[PDB]
Amino acid sequence: LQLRPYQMEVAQPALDGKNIIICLPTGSGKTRVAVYITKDHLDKKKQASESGKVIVLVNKVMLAEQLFRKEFNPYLKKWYRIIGLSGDTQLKISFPEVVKSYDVIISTAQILENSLLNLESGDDDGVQLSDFSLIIIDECHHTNKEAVYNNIMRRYLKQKLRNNDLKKQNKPAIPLPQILGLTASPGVGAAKKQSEAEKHILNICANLDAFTIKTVKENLGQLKHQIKEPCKKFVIADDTRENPFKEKLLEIMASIQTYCQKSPMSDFGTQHYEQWAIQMEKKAAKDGNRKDRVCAEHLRKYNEALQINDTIRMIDAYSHLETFYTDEKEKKFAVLNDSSLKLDETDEFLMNLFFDNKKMLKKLAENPKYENEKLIKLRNTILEQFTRSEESSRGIIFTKTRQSTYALSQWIMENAKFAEVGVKAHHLIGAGHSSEVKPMTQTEQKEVISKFRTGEINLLIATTVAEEGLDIKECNIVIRYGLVTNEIAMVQARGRARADESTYVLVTSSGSGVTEREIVNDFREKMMYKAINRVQNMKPEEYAHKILELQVQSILEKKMKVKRSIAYNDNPSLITLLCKNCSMLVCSGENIHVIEKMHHVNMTPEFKGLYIVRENKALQKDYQTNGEIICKCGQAWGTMMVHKGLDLPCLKIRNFVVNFKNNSPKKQYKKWVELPIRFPDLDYSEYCL
RNA sequence: CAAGCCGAGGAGAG
RNA sequence: CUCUCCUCGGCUUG
Ligand SMILES: Nc1ncnc2c1ncn2[C@@H]1O[C@H](COP(=O)(O)OP(=O)(O)OP(=O)(O)O)[C@@H](O)[C@H]1O
Ligand SMILES: [Zn+2]
Numbered sequence A: 001l002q003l004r005p006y007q008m009e010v011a012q013p014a015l016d017g018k019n020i021i022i023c024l025p026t027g028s029g030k031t032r033v034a035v036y037i038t039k040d041h042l043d044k045k046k047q048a049s050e051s052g053k054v055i056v057l058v059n060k061v062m063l064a065e066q067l068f069r070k071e072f073n074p075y076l077k078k079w080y081r082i083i084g085l086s087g088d089t090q091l092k093i094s095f096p097e098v099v100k101s102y103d104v105i106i107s108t109a110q111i112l113e114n115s116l117l118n119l120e121s122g123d124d125d126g127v128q129l130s131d132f133s134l135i136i137i138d139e140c141h142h143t144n145k146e147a148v149y150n151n152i153m154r155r156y157l158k159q160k161l162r163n164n165d166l167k168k169q170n171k172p173a174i175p176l177p178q179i180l181g182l183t184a185s186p187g188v189g190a191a192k193k194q195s196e197a198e199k200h201i202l203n204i205c206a207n208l209d210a211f212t213i214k215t216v217k218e219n220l221g222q223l224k225h226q227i228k229e230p231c232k233k234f235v236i237a238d239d240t241r242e243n244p245f246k247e248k249l250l251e252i253m254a255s256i257q258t259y260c261q262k263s264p265m266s267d268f269g270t271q272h273y274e275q276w277a278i279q280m281e282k283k284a285a286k287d288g289n290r291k292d293r294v295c296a297e298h299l300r301k302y303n304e305a306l307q308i309n310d311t312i313r314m315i316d317a318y319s320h321l322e323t324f325y326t327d328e329k330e331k332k333f334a335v336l337n338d339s340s341l342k343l344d345e346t347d348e349f350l351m352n353l354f355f356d357n358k359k360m361l362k363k364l365a366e367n368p369k370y371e372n373e374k375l376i377k378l379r380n381t382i383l384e385q386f387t388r389s390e391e392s393s394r395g396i397i398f399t400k401t402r403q404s405t406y407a408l409s410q411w412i413m414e415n416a417k418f419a420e421v422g423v424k425a426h427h428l429i430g431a432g433h434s435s436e437v438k439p440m441t442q443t444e445q446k447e448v449i450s451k452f453r454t455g456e457i458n459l460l461i462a463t464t465v466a467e468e469g470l471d472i473k474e475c476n477i478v479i480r481y482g483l484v485t486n487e488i489a490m491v492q493a494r495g496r497a498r499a500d501e502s503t504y505v506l507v508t509s510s511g512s513g514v515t516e517r518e519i520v521n522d523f524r525e526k527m528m529y530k531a532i533n534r535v536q537n538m539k540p541e542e543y544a545h546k547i548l549e550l551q552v553q554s555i556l557e558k559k560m561k562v563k564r565s566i567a568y569n570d571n572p573s574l575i576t577l578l579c580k581n582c583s584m585l586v587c588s589g590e591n592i593h594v595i596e597k598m599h600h601v602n603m604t605p606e607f608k609g610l611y612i613v614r615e616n617k618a619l620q621k622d623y624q625t626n627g628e629i630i631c632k633c634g635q636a637w638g639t640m641m642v643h644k645g646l647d648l649p650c651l652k653i654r655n656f657v658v659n660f661k662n663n664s665p666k667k668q669y670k671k672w673v674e675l676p677i678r679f680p681d682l683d684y685s686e687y688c689l
Numbered sequence B: 001c002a003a004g005c006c007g008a009g010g011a012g013a014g
Numbered sequence C: 001c002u003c004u005c006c007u008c009g010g011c012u013u014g
Helices: A005-015 A030-047 A062-076 A110-121 A150-169 A194-207 A220-226 A243-260 A272-287 A293-309 A314-336 A345-365 A373-388 A403-414 A416-420 A442-454 A487-494 A515-536 A540-566
Strands: A020-023 A054-058 A082-085 A104-108 A134-137 A178-183 A231-237 A395-398 A425-428 A459-462 A503-509 A575-579 A584-588 A592-595 A599-602 A628-630 A636-639 A656-660
Touching (some): A030 A134, A054 A062, A062 A442, A272 A293, A293 A345, A293 A403, A314 A403, A373 A503, A503 A515
Parallel strands (some): A054 A104, A054 A134, A134 A178
Antiparallel strands (some): A575 A656, A628 A636
């Protein structure tokens, strides 16, 4: 309802037209000033007898409900009609109609793009930008190459150039809306010079039709008093040890390579070796040669184990391998449980190579003489704070992978010292259904946030989900364990730690360039402000000229892209799908069908009598509903499916291999859209009637 | 709650 | 340009 002094000046030009960007630091009441500007805009459009509608755009799902509950509704409930949309309600259905009411909309973005392209592609109702008078945005800095709402802004700019060309031609120029982007920092877009950074800023300002940036400069002391930074801090460690376990694994890896007669020309325990392994597997599968592809699939697991060894305990890698080989033995026993039994030489050699050393590795792993350095350093770092703050002790840990989060949470649950000091901990990751891990769900996320704000969990171990959006309580001891993405995540994490005696820690090893990257991002942070100062003081006419040039280039860079996007044959049955582990036939292209033009499936008894089902583990931690399919060899293929009560089994194209009938350039595809040919829709005329 | 499709961005390494 | 990791969004079957 009321404004601050430093918010007043930064908001001021927006109050009379003047589409702009606003970059303030974190936590300066960005949402609140957005709210004031909404209220002023609507009251103004009322006093002039003009229709007024505001739409807010966000990138995530939770920010919509967040802002609907905390900021917009509690202040605007009395004067105006408010609503909040996402893909997690039922209000998505009549989007063209809610616009006819509800002067204040909050929304996830791609709703709007879907409605626009429905208006411009089909005969649906749809909507256009003309039905609005203001678009407020969160997190401007995502406006880049073919992102979510660069699309929208490309259409806005297309219509603006239409209006500008028409100004000289006709009088009736459509009234375009006003645009108010909000952010924390637009961020330099990967540029090695101050000038290229300036260029990137101007590209953003073009893609938002802005007029200025309006950083706070004048009423600055009030900001420093109300708002403060943490202290940057580095904690490095090193190792000159860990021979017994590492070498105990390298021996195995060398044995396998010398069993395969392959030359890596690389090092064990890095990423180039992994890349080599992947391409070797793909080549061996395109050829069909076993004894080299499966050993590659195993060496990948060993390399991953070594990689996590550099950051995590030996026991976690041992558990990884244990789960893997246990699953494999279970697969082989499920296969041989039916009908005579033949064994392979390769898998036999590998299992005999592993299980003989399994107890050895379990003994070597448990050895606190040389556990790891970084873990101990963060032990010191954590215990310092949690002894200092005494029950006002909130916390965040950031890391790279998901599995690291589970391991760290388990570890903190085990070791008594953390529980003694009141270190209640919990993990957190994102919902993408990929990456060989069971993701979490939005509900568990929200619950964890609410427990954090309550204080049931003192510290949150997280992946990069946290270094934006969702509103975590002010913290003290944000750290960074093996992750440096860019300046944006850096500054956003650096904006979390309020509650004085806050920090910003970075934990790395010696022989992995990371502090390098930290310092690079620090300099980029110091550079973008200089560029901002260079452009704020730029001449207006030169600014206008430059943004016009950039808008033109951005619209022409779309058109060129469009031609290649639109430009694809149709072969009904010119392929055969084989198993990828075992060079064995599975299916032809004709047997396959599609449901809802998305899910691929087969419904011939021949394919029904060529696989075995097992029990789901994701649903084991109940009754299984979506079984996991396997081959007679052991390779997982797909997943069950329940369409119209029929238990017709789906499948993937990541686990199979293609053979064309002509000349056998066998290929791997990793997903269905990449290949050119089309499959037919499903119909019950086959198998029935 | 499980399963799958499509699109986008960031980082590394090559 | 490729591989991997991380995140997000929209949409289907159950
Ligand atoms: N003008 C204001 N006067 C008083 N308190 C304010 C004002 N603006 C914001 N706040 C307070 O700040 C809290 C949230 O605002 P804050 O800016 O810290 O988070 P935010 O808006 O999400 O910032 P960011 O999006 O950058 O994290 C609210 O609880 C509110 O009480
Ligand atoms: Zn097989």
